């Protein structure tokens, strides 16, 4: 999956991993999303993981209107999921930044 | 889950988890599981050193998001224990580093 990721503050960067879901053929007059629930992994210890998940998963249900497309048939229902994460700067502070100092 | 913090002396557990995709344990249950592994001639040429016969488990996974007694699935779990062959890392990495 692709998304807008900004690594300038690396190794102290935070990222938003996103999932966007939409019907391929049916507009919101034929198919509309009514709710979205997201379940993630149960974490034991985060010191070993590259990323740390800060906060529960955010969700949205919106409408996408396409100009390139009868009236009121150019709108599709979209689900958006967002998982906020923060990088583990440990490895980069001790093996890279400190020796460079 | 794999922890390489004691590299090159780390020890890993290789797992396979098997479960019916659609039929709960009221419809399909695993009655038994047997595992067969490679007969090793000599492990000196191998990257990982297997330790012990394969371990097995048969359990029930209960899912809270399927709402009577229809939300438990049968799961097989196989585990192969192995230790890293450290010879190369000992002689070509750790030793020259101590000298430096």
């Amino acid at each position: 999956f692709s998304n807008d990721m900004d690594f300038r503050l690396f190794p102290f960067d935070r990222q938003q991993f996103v999932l966007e879901l939409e019907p391929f053929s049916y507009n919101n007059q034929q198919l509309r999303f009514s709710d979205i629930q997201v379940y993630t992994e149960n974490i034991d210890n985060e010191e070993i993981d590259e990323w740390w998940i800060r906060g529960k998963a955010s969700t949205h249900i919106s409408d996408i209107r396409y100009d390139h497309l009868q009236p009121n048939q150019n709108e599709f229902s979209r689900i958006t999921v967002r998982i906020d994460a923060v990088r583990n700067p440990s490895y980069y502070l001790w093996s890279f930044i400190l020796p460079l100092g | 889950d794999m922890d390489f913090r004691l590299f090159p002396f780390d020890r890993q557990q290789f797992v396979l988890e098997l479960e019916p995709f659609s039929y709960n344990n009221q419809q399909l249950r695993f009655s038994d599981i047997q595992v067969y592994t490679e007969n090793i001639d000599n492990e000196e040429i191998d990257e990982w050193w297997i330790r012990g016969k394969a371990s097995t488990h048969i359990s029930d996974i209960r899912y809270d998001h399927l709402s009577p007694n229809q939300n438990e699935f049968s799961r097989i779990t196989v585990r192969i224990d192995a230790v890293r062959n450290p010879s190369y890392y000992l002689w070509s990495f750790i030793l020259p580093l101590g000298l430096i």
Partner: nanobody
Amino acid sequence: QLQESGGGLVQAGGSLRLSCAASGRIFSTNVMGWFRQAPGKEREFVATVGRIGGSTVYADFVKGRFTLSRDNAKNMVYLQMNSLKPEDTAVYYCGARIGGSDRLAPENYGYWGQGTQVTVS
């Protein structure tokens, strides 16, 4: 350190609610699991949380009779045991998963508690 409680004597078919108090460096109760050991037999898995949210792993003998829950506020887990039978008589231990890659393996648990006896006639 872990401490169990809630055991005792119960009639075949009755219930019990085991409790495991957790103290120390434990970010979440997910790492905790229940085990039991009868005299002469080996320590066998009973219940712990599942990897993915909403799932829980139970031993095959549970057969829906036990239920593991957690009180992250008090930093605890509870094993609600119903429809108990003489086969369930054992010392029930509470363990904390200290790594490894097998939720059902006693070898991957440390910080065991004293255990609490469960006895069914």
